UniProtKB/Swiss-Prot annotation:
Belongs to the glycosyl hydrolase 10 (cellulase F) family. Endoxylanase with high hydrolytic activity on birchwood and oat spelt xylan. Xylotetraose, xylotriose, xylobiose and xylose are the main products from birchwood xylan hydrolysis. Shows increasing activity on xylo-oligosaccharides of increasing length. Displays very low hydrolytic activity on Avicel, carboxymethylcellulose (CMC) and p-nitrophenyl-beta-xylopyranoside. Also shows transxylosidase activity, allowing the formation of xylo-oligosaccharides of higher degree of polymerization than the starting substrate. Consists of three different domains. The central region of the enzyme is the catalytic domain. The N-terminal region contains cenC-type cellulose-binding domains and seems to act as a thermostabilizing domain: a derivative lacking this region shows a lower optimum temperature for activity (35 degrees Celsius) than the full-length enzyme, and a reduced thermal stability that results in a complete inactivation of the enzyme after 2 hours incubation at 55 degrees Celsius. The C-terminal region contains family 9 carbohydrate-binding modules. Coiled coil: none annotated. Residues 1-161 form the CBM-cenC domain. The chain holds residues 199 to 359 of 1086 of the full protein. This is Endo-1,4-beta-xylanase C. It comes from the Bacteria.
Length: 161
């Protein structure tokens, strides 16, 4: 257990939006629990909840990341992805993005999204590594309402391997 967020304290902590979307810790909705992190007012597929995790981790290591997701409005099914945003040498114009996992969710049902990931070594100059959830990429002109549904995440966990 290197990092855990279950939201049961009601705290947003260091979670943040990627763009103009809205994050809220809600009560009465959670994965086998009363609280979770809702992302709404999404207007791009890449809007979604993000948190910096590099400080929790040993550079060079392999770790297992998992989280639970759920959505409860719009289409009968929808894909959610779990991804990493990486920064090197504090260069914010050349961020890297890598999807680590994706699953099809059924409306109203919690599902686990997980994978092993690699934490780059110190000598790479890695300066940020953030996990985030999103829907599959579409260019801004092609985005539809089903792509920008609000969704919940909960029980975010990173474990040693
Ligand atoms: Ca919870």
């Amino acid at each position: 257990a290197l990092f855990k967020a279950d939201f049961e304290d009601g705290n947003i902590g260091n979670w943040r939006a990627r763009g103009t979307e809205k994050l809220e810790v809600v009560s009465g909705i959670g994965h086998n629990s009363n609280r979770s992190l809702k992302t709404s007012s999404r207007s791009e597929t890449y809007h979604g909840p993000l948190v910096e995790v590099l400080p929790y981790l040993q550079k060079g290591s392999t770790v297992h990341i998992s989280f639970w997701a759920m959505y409860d409005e719009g289409p009968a099914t929808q894909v959610i992805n779990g991804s990493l945003e990486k920064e090197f040498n504090r260069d914010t114009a050349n961020l890297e993005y890598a999807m680590f996992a994706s699953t099809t969710l059924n409306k109203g049902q919690w599902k686990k999204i997980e994978a092993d990931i690699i934490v780059p070594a110190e000598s790479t100059g890695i300066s940020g590594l953030r996990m985030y959830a999103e829907t599959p990429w579409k260019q801004s002109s092609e985005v539809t309402e089903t792509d920008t549904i609000p969704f919940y995440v909960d029980d975010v966990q990173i474990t040693a391997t």
